[PDB]
């Protein structure tokens, strides 16, 4: 369903997923809530990525152990355990950024994304070409 241009990073260390849209870091709150925050000091923005298969990743909160996941209705949530909804296709975009496509909903082009207001986007509302889906992994 999708191209295979991969980004040039590794999963050695945790990262911050900086969204260029509004400048928010992706956050997985203890209650399972997922949003974005501009507070670099937030304890819930440190994520450990890991590769399942080449180009397939898990995105986990170092603080809580929760996995980033996208539900049947396109809502991002924090999962206590790894499941099919937790896999994302990590790809390069615009020869620069990282994008994360829901593996489970790949055919539909549902992406991880953050609005200028700090609220995450719902799967069906995302699409190729948007600013909300563009991320830069920053060191913690």
Curated annotation (Swiss-Prot):
Predominantly expressed in kidney and brain. Detected at much lower levels in heart and skeletal muscle. The lineage of its organism: Eukaryota, Metazoa, Chordata, Craniata, Vertebrata. InterPro entries: Fibroblast_GF_fam (IPR002209), IL1/FGF (IPR008996). Changing residue 122 to E: Reduced integrin-binding. Defective in integrin-, heparin- and FGFR1-binding, and defective in inducing FGF1 signaling, cell proliferation and cell migration. This is Fibroblast growth factor 1. Plays an important role in the regulation of cell survival, cell division, angiogenesis, cell differentiation and cell migration. Functions as a potent mitogen in vitro. Acts as a ligand for FGFR1 and integrins. Binds to FGFR1 in the presence of heparin leading to FGFR1 dimerization and activation via sequential autophosphorylation on tyrosine residues which act as docking sites for interacting proteins, leading to the activation of several signaling cascades. Binds to integrin ITGAV:ITGB3. Changing residue 121 to A: Loss of LRRC59-binding. It comes from Homo sapiens. Monomer. Homodimer. Interacts with FGFR1, FGFR2, FGFR3 and FGFR4. Affinity between fibroblast growth factors (FGFs) and their receptors is increased by heparan sulfate glycosaminoglycans that function as coreceptors. Found in a complex with FGFBP1, FGF1 and FGF2. Interacts with FGFBP1. Part of a Cu(2+)-dependent multiprotein aggregate containing FGF1, S100A13 and SYT1. Interacts with SYT1. Interacts with S100A13. Interacts with LRRC59. Interacts with CSNKA, CSNKB and FIBP. While binding with LRRC59, CSNKA and FIBP seem mutually exclusive, CSNKB and FIBP may cooperatively interact with FGF1.
């Amino acid at each position: 369903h999708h191209h295979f241009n991969l980004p040039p990073g590794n999963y050695k260390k945790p990262k911050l997923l900086y969204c260029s849209n509004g400048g928010h870091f992706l956050r997985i709150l203890p209650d399972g809530t997922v949003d974005g925050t501009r507070d670099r000091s937030d304890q819930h923005i440190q994520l450990q990525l890991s590769a399942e298969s080449v180009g397939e990743v898990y995105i986990k909160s170092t603080e809580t152990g929760q996995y980033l996941a996208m539900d049947t209705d396109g809502l991002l949530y924090g999962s206590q355990t790894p499941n099919e909804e937790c896999l994302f296709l990590e790809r390069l975009e615009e020869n620069h950024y990282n994008t994360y496509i829901s593996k489970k909903h790949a055919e539909k082009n549902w992406f991880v994304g953050i609005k200028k207001n700090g609220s995450c986007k719902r799967g069906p509302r995302t699409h190729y070409g948007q600013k909300a889906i563009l991320f830069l992994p920053l060191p913690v």
